[PDB]
Amino acid sequence: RFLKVKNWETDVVLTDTLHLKSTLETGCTEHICMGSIMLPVRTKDQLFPLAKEFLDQYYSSIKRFGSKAHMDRLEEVNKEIESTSTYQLKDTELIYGAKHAWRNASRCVGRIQWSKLQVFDARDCTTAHGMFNYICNHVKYATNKGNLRSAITIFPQRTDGKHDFRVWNSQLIRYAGYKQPDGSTLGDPANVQFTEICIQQGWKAPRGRFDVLPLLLQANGNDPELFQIPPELVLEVPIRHPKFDWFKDLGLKWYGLPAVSNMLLEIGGLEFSACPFSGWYMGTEIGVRDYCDNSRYNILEEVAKKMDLDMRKTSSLWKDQALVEINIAVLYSFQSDKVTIVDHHSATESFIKHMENEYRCRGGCPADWVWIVPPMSGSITPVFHQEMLNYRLTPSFEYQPDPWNTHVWKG
Amino acid sequence: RFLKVKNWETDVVLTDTLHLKSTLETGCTEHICMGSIMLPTKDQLFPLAKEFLDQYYSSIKRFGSKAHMDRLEEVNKEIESTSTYQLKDTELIYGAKHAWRNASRCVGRIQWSKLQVFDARDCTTAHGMFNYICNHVKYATNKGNLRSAITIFPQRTDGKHDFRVWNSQLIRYAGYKQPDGSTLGDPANVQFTEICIQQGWKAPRGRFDVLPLLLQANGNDPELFQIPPELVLEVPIRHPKFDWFKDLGLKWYGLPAVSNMLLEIGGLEFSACPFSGWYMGTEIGVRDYCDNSRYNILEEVAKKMDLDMRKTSSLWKDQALVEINIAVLYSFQSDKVTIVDHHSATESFIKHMENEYRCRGGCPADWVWIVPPMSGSITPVFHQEMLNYRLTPSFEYQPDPWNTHVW
Ligand code: HEM
Ligand code: HEM
Ligand SMILES: Cc1cc(N)nc(CCc2cncc(C3CCN(C)CC3)c2)c1
Ligand SMILES: Cc1cc(N)nc(CCc2cncc(C3CCN(C)CC3)c2)c1
Ligand SMILES: C[C@H](O)[C@H](O)[C@H]1CNc2nc(N)[nH]c(=O)c2N1
Ligand SMILES: C[C@H](O)[C@H](O)[C@H]1CNc2nc(N)[nH]c(=O)c2N1
Ligand SMILES: [Zn+2]
Incomplete structure (x- = not known):
């Protein structure tokens, strides 16, 4: 099946075939479009086909589809799943997976850069103190004295859902918000609730307009712990x-x-609940x-x-x-x-070239117009005039509930 | 099945029930959203008429009344006999206002109930269409104090006698491709301008030439008319x-003034229905x-x-x-x-949306079209979740007549 998109400024028409590979649902139906809606424990049963789909894509990408190495790997994962109810990704697969989640992120205008991502494997991390160290290192690497470099740090995957790793901060660096008794707000009004949690957890708030929030880090399903990012690392x-x-x-x-830190990275059916990533x-x-x-x-x-x-x-x-x-x-x-x-x-000009390149070489580029078009001067950027198709491919970045609403407190 | 929309600026949540009455399809599926795509018989006819008449009679608090039943009765007989039916003036006016009320891509719908409807169903010739359109233009313009209006020409019969305004809008500027390879005037109108010239328009070849009207009556070949210069403000x-x-x-x-759309009311199709606001x-x-x-x-x-x-x-x-x-x-x-x-405009629309949710259970809205082409997020509609769905009566796109017309 073929779907065409047209650019109404240039009359360039592109043909999408990639959408045939989409698995997740959109939220829309034949009767309703939910395109402007912000937000519209896996059995072995559902897990192996997800692993198999991913591994097939990985081995195709390295031109080893149907190789013995491919077949052996499927075999190895199947046995690991039936034995242990889950499986571990190889470093190569993890890296491929993280890059493709970014490549597949239909709300991201920055995707021309997707193949240049530094992947920090933090799957050996066990404690919140360990998470803190990993994240400091990510911040230092990514910042690079102002010459920013894209990076993602990946903490251990979900097991039974009672041992999740989570970064409670929605983003690694954000300013505190304080609600005043008169109803006015000091700092960033968006972060009032989280700031309150931090204070409750023992953070001493300076109560200024641009206070860098502490990290609230959860390892292995334990209660989260507070850490202050070294100010010298916060550019x-x-x-x-x-x-x-x-x-x-x-x-x-x-x-x-x-640096977004509240999203879930799905690769081959595995769920990485703590996977902070950053660009510029x-x-x-x-x-x-x-x-x-x-x-x-x-x-x-x-x-x-x-x-x-x-x-x-x-x-x-x-x-x-x-x-x-x-x-x-x-x-x-x-x-x-x-x-x-x-x-x-x-950025939007680069995106258009990326999107066109993706169509030619990949058969499509899922994109969410509502997010891609900038919040000012929309129609004087080329994305405004570009028809887009939004669909969901895996690996992917997904939303997940805020940890404070779901966490079981140990005390 | 009962859907909520949230405004992320105000935290206000509205609950939409109106979408459950939608009939036409969106172009989207469970697997793909096409939200950014610009263009995604007696047995057919009677349920459409009934659905419309039910909503009309509900609107005047006479649902299930004998007059409701009598009208329904009368329409069905008329369809069986004549294969079509004629709307009462009250129904035509109601339908036109609701077509606008239902236009998901229109930010100006707070004005919907204040629409002047000109019944031009008695029109038979292209000269008649011209007169009716001049009158529309003059009424709507009102020396600069604009008034919303629609003029409705005879409905489709066998599809072979369509009334059409060939122009996409009543008032637009010509476009000419130059030897210099440049474009003179409005580049969006080069093709239509060529058709006007082919049909005998003597073009001034300026940068702001008001195009003539190309009017088609009763399926006949379109004729050329120039809107009186003193009526184009x-x-x-x-x-x-x-x-x-x-x-x-x-x-x-x-x-x-949009002139290329199709107005659907009660299964009837009005292929010529120019409408205007400000x-x-x-x-x-x-x-x-x-x-x-x-x-x-x-x-x-x-x-x-x-x-x-x-x-x-x-x-x-x-x-x-x-x-x-x-x-x-x-x-x-x-x-x-x-x-x-x-x-x-967008502030008005948020107030309208809230009225519509409060009094109708929803308001179909296309965010891609509703959000202005500049300064998007400093207008409130940017932060407003919207559900897009198709209700009738409606304005629909239709194919351009020069790809349709058997000359
Ligand atoms: C390298 C330069 C990058 C630029 C210029 C860029 C640009 C953007 C922008 C403007 C947004 C919208 C953010 C918002 O409105 O809140 C966005 C969203 C997003 N970006 Fe990119 N980005 C970059 C890098 C990355 C990287 C490295 C990743 C992951 C590895 C990524 C994944 C995403 C995802 C998943 C979203 C959707 C976020 C959400 O739904 O909240 N981006 N990007
Ligand atoms: C009175 C003030 C009005 C305002 C401020 C207004 C505003 C707008 C705007 C800005 C658009 C987008 C147009 C574009 O981007 O090309 C639009 C579209 C539309 N309007 Fe309204 N409008 C008004 C009156 C009306 C009336 C009187 C009707 C019908 C009786 C109407 C029906 C429509 C329809 C069907 C569309 C979508 C047209 C298309 O798809 O090309 N509008 N309106
Ligand atoms: C990887 C990446 C790159 C980029 N250019 N932007 C982002 C989003 C950055 C970001 C940082 N702090 C806070 C936010 C919030 C702002 C308010 N939004 C409603 C949600 C995201 C977003 C992520
Ligand atoms: C009733 C109504 C009110 C309003 N404010 N705007 C409109 C759209 C009017 C309109 C007038 N001339 C030209 C156009 C064109 C511009 C270029 N677009 C691609 C198509 C529509 C649209 C209609
Ligand atoms: C309601 C609407 O979906 C919401 O305001 C969206 C619109 N587009 C956006 N686009 C970007 N890039 N980021 C956003 O937060 C939003 N918010
Ligand atoms: C491709 C995209 O749908 C197209 O450029 C749309 C975007 N939003 C629009 N919004 C309005 N009001 N009018 C338009 O012509 C368009 N064009
Ligand atoms: Zn959709």
């Missing part, structure tokens, strides 16, 4: 504007390393969402006041004008400090 | 700060002016602003974009021509 960038000298006095900064920022993530969402730092008003825009009616587009200047400032600041960042024009 | 574009902006020579038309600024300033395949003016504007266009990361494109959109809104407002900015 930050003071935000200033190239023309507006008052912009520095807004007191803004941000961290250099975007696209400017709009900070300049549009982190700074300008009403529910985040929400600085649009203050900035517009300082530019002396007409703020009496929305039709002066004061919000849009200020948004642009803020995003110029983010990019300017990171570039000036030689910290890797990419603008939304470059 | 246009706005010269200037900027409140940049004096040089007027020198770009830009203008646009005040009346957004513009949201970004339609002109972002898409019409800044799409690379349209008037594509970003570079010229950025140069006049003397921006550093060496690096993408200067965001010169984004800066020029905002100023272009400031000029559009300022120009329409200064000339007192109705227009809405994307902040006001």
